[PDB]
Each structure stands twice: as C-alpha cells, then as structure tokens.
Design an enzyme around this catalytic site. Structure first.
Site, short mmCIF file in Angstrom:
data_model
loop_
_atom_site.label_atom_id
_atom_site.label_comp_id
_atom_site.label_asym_id
_atom_site.label_seq_id
_atom_site.Cartn_x
_atom_site.Cartn_y
_atom_site.Cartn_z
N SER A 180 -7.63 -5.61 -4.93
CA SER A 180 -6.69 -5.50 -5.78
C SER A 180 -6.18 -4.58 -6.18
O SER A 180 -5.70 -3.45 -6.00
CB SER A 180 -6.93 -6.66 -6.52
OG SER A 180 -5.69 -7.23 -8.00
N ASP B 198 -0.06 -3.87 -7.70
CA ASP B 198 -0.93 -3.61 -8.03
C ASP B 198 -1.44 -3.29 -6.43
O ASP B 198 -0.34 -3.74 -5.36
CB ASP B 198 -1.86 -4.89 -8.23
CG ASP B 198 -2.19 -6.74 -7.85
OD1 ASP B 198 -0.69 -6.87 -6.72
OD2 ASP B 198 -2.16 -6.63 -7.96
N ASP C 206 -3.05 -5.14 -3.53
CA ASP C 206 -2.71 -6.19 -2.27
C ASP C 206 -1.44 -7.45 -2.69
O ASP C 206 -1.12 -8.08 -2.22
CB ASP C 206 -3.83 -7.24 -2.89
CG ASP C 206 -4.05 -8.25 -4.05
OD1 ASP C 206 -3.14 -7.02 -5.32
OD2 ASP C 206 -4.26 -9.15 -3.56
MG LIG Z 1 -3.54 -8.25 -6.57
#
Ligand SMILES: [Mg+2]
Ligand SMILES: O=P(O)(O)OC[C@H]1O[C@H](O)[C@@H](O)[C@@H](O)[C@@H]1O
Length: 448
Positions: free
Chosen positions: A97, A237, A239
C-alpha cells in the site's frame, strides 16, 4: 512468539526477514486449505519484490491443487473485483500500500472477495505456516494469465452517465504507484483532460513512497491543480484503494466530507438506500444521507466491519474518513476509482465546483482532522480524558473505542487497528472556536 507480519487485517512485513518467498509459498499452501473450492486470483503492486512473492504464492497454491488466475500488475480493488467477477474461491493482492521501500505484504480474500482477517482465517493461516515443516510439493494445478481489464473498466464506467460529463481538467497523482495505468485505460472513454503527476509506475519511488497524507506529497497535487487551473485533483496510495481529493484552490478536502457527498451521489442513482459510515466523524454524513432520502447505518471502522455491515444491510454505499469508499455492486468492495468518477459526474451535472460542493458542509460541521497519539499508557490516557469530561455527562457510545456527544460537539477516541496509536477526531456544530479549544484540551489530557 508469532510471525510479526500477520496483522489484524492483512500481512505486512519487511522483506526478507518478516516476509519472503518461503513464507509466501507456505501462505499459498495454507490458504488453499482455508477456501471453498475454486481457483484463486493473484495480483500485485509496483513494489520490486511483489512479482517474486506472487510467484511463490502461486507455487504453494498450485502444489495444493488450486488453479491460479494471474491478473498481473494491478490495484487491490482489481483483486477484489476479479475474485468476485470470476467466481473464484479467493484472491490475494501482494502489496504494501503506502509503506516504506523495504516492506511488502498481502491482502487476502475468499469468495465474493470477502475479507480474510485475523479472526476469520488469517491467524489460522499464520499458525499453519508457523508449524509447517513439510517438504514443498510440486504443482498439480495450472496458472492462467488473465490480464484483461475490460469487465473491470466497464464496471467503473457504469457508475456515470458519460453523456453528462464535461471536459473537466483533472490532476491525477498516482505517486508512482499503479493508479495511472487505470486512468490511462479510462481516458479514451472520458472527455476529461488529465494533468498527470508522478504518473509512471516505479517501485523505487523516486518521488517518495505513495502516501498522499505526507504534506510534501500533498503539495505536489495541490501545486499541479493551482498551476494548471484544474477543476480538481485526485491522488492515490500505491495500491489505489484510497483516494484523496483537492479542490480547484489546491485545498486538500478532508475525507470525512467525501462520505456525505458520495452518499448523495449514490442515492440519486439508488433512492432510499442504506449508507454505512464509521463512528469517527458522523454528524455531517447522517444529515446528508437523510436529506438525500437514504438511511445511515453506524458501523465500527475497518474494511472488514464496513463490508460485513453493508452486506447484512444491503447497503448501497459505505464510506470511511480514512479515504475508503465501498460500493455494493463492486462486490461490496472499496475502490479508489469509482469515487472520482462520481465526483467528476457531480461537478459536471451540477455546475458547482468541488470546493462549493463541500464548503457549507465544512462550515456546518468543522472537524479537527484525525490526530494521532503515541503515549506511554493509552488506557490511562483515555481514562484521564473521560474523567475530565464526566461532569458534563456526555452521551457515550462504545461502537469503536469511545464516542462522546456533548450536544454542540463530540469526539471519537479509539485505538488504531493498523498501528499502536490512539486516534482522535473532534467535530462541532458550526463552531470553530469550540472545536479548537476542545481539541487542544483533549490533546493536553492525552499527553498527561
Ligand atoms: Mg492502500
Ligand atoms: O484507524 P485504523 O484502525 O488504523 O484503520 C485505518 C484504515 O486502515 C486500512 O486502510 C483499512 O482497514 C481501513 O478500513 C481502515 O479505516
């Protein structure tokens, strides 16, 4: 002890001491014993170690007789969508992430992309992996490459009436994560002009780790909006399951206000529906959902709780102020893409700027922003806060830590499920002075 990479809701650790290909392969073996029948979807983010960790997962899965659907480099929401859409037994996203360069991890789901968490199979997987000294078997099942994003892209586009969209100028900031690839695939079907910042995927993260909450990373989006006269900006972010909005003045919009705004957008398309919201900041969402003819449903924060509650309520939308937005038709999953398509549609159809869409709501329910505290004794610190305010007899709610409603102001104070911190949120009924004096007073008590 126990493997530190297994957290309450996902796997996250430093490579290679807390997470490595051996562990990843063992996780594949253990996951296979936890799922109903069917294949397993695997995708991964831009981090340098992610492909190798995915291959190891695939090897363990196939050694245990699971067919693997490799969807390739993708966002977390694509693992959710393909797991549900392809009626797979489960899915894994290899991602960290927003975490530093030396970290990786995994998000695991079962049928319909239902989360696997510490109490719902993740710690069972940990304990299996922890004790597994077996020789690795060889694959008895196949891996198929399934990178087609057509169904996913069509699903994204179905949330908006493309003929109503205006050629807005939108800053997009993938932060060198994976969001730009989806933007570019959507672009031919949309009239917008994109101003692309930090657009190319690069797991070396030359411009900083993908965390739009860092003020230095925030400022790159804000500058691009201001310098280009953009209607608004969007950052993600790494991902891209979280999205962050900037209005035409460059101002970052607190995620809290997007919950009410997206709920109104959704309720126009699905009247009377239920909307799930977290307990951190509440008053604005309740009011906006009710004004739009929906029914607000309070729920403990955390994507596992949100999705469970949305399912049991047939809720059309759910939103947290931590920048996660969940959609019933999207397998009840969160998407960092659906929200900005909806906001772009709302700006286009209303003729209002994003700033004006939220301004009156920010004035009506000003909030502190989420303030984090690492204290010597969280429990004693919370007790000190509650004892100080006892004489005002607030209305107390224990859905998620402690929520205290004093009438003209309220707070939520809870332990994080992803870091060892206390998180404070305060809001008031149109009173910025009371907001600051109460926030500072709580802060002093917590630091005592
Ligand atoms: Mg994330
Ligand atoms: O405040 P917390 O407990 O650290 O969680 C913050 C967020 O972490 C993850 O991104 C998700 O699980 C979200 O659902 C959650 O809101």
């Amino acid at each position: 002890m126990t493997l530190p990479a297994f957290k309450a809701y996902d796997i996250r650790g430093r490579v290679p001491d807390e997470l490595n290909e051996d562990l990843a392969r063992r996780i594949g073996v253990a996951l296979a014993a936890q799922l109903d029948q069917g294949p397993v979807v695997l995708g991964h983010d831009v981090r340098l170690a992610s492909p190798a960790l995915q291959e190891a997962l695939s090897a363990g899965l196939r050694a245990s007789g699971r067919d693997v659907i490799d969807i390739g480099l993708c966002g977390t929401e694509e693992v959710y969508f393909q797991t549900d859409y392809l009626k797979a037994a489960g899915g894994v996203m290899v991602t960290a992430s927003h975490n530093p360069m030396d970290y990786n991890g995994m998000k695991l789901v079962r049928e319909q992309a239902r989360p696997i968490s510490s109490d719902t199979g993740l710690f069972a997987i940990r304990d299996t992996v922890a004790a597994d000294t077996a020789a690795p078997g060889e694959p008895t099942a196949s891996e198929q490459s399934r990178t087609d994003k057509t169904a996913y892209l069509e699903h994204l586009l179905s949330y908006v009436d493309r003929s109503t969209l205006k050629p807005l100028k939108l800053v997009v900031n993938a932060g060198n994560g994976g969001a730009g690839l989806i933007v570019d695939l959507l672009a031919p079907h949309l009239p917008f002009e994109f101003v692309r910042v930090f657009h190319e995927p690069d797991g070396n993260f030359p411009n900083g780790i993908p965390n739009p909450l860092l003020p230095e990373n925030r400022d790159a989006t804000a500058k691009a909006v201001k310098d280009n006269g953009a209607d608004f900006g969007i950052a993600w972010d790494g991902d891209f399951d979280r999205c962050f909005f900037f209005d035409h003045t460059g101002r970052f919009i607190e995620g809290y206000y997007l919950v009410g705004l997206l709920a109104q957008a959704i309720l126009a398309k699905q009247p009377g529906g239920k909307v799930v919201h977290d307990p951190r900041l509440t008053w604005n969402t309740v009011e906006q959902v009710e004004e739009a003819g929906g029914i607000p449903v309070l729920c403990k924060s955390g994507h596992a709780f949100i999705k469970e509650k949305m399912r049991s309520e047939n809720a059309v939308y759910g939103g947290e102020m931590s920048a996660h937005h969940y959609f019933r038709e999207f397998a009840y999953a969160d998407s960092g893409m659906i929200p900005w398509l909806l906001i772009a549609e709302l700006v286009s159809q209303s003729g209002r700027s994003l700033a004006d869409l939220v301004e009156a709501r920010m004035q009506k329910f000003p909030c502190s922003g989420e303030i984090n505290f690492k204290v010597a004794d969280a429990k004693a610190s919370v007790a000190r806060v509650m004892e100080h305010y006892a004489s005002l007899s607030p209305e107390l709610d224990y859905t998620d830590g402690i929520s205290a409603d004093f009438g003209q102001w309220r707070f939520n104070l809870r332990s994080s499920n992803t870091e060892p911190l206390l998180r404070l949120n305060v809001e008031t009924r149109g009173d910025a002075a009371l907001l600051e004096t109460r926030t500072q007073e709580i802060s002093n008590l917590l630091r005592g």
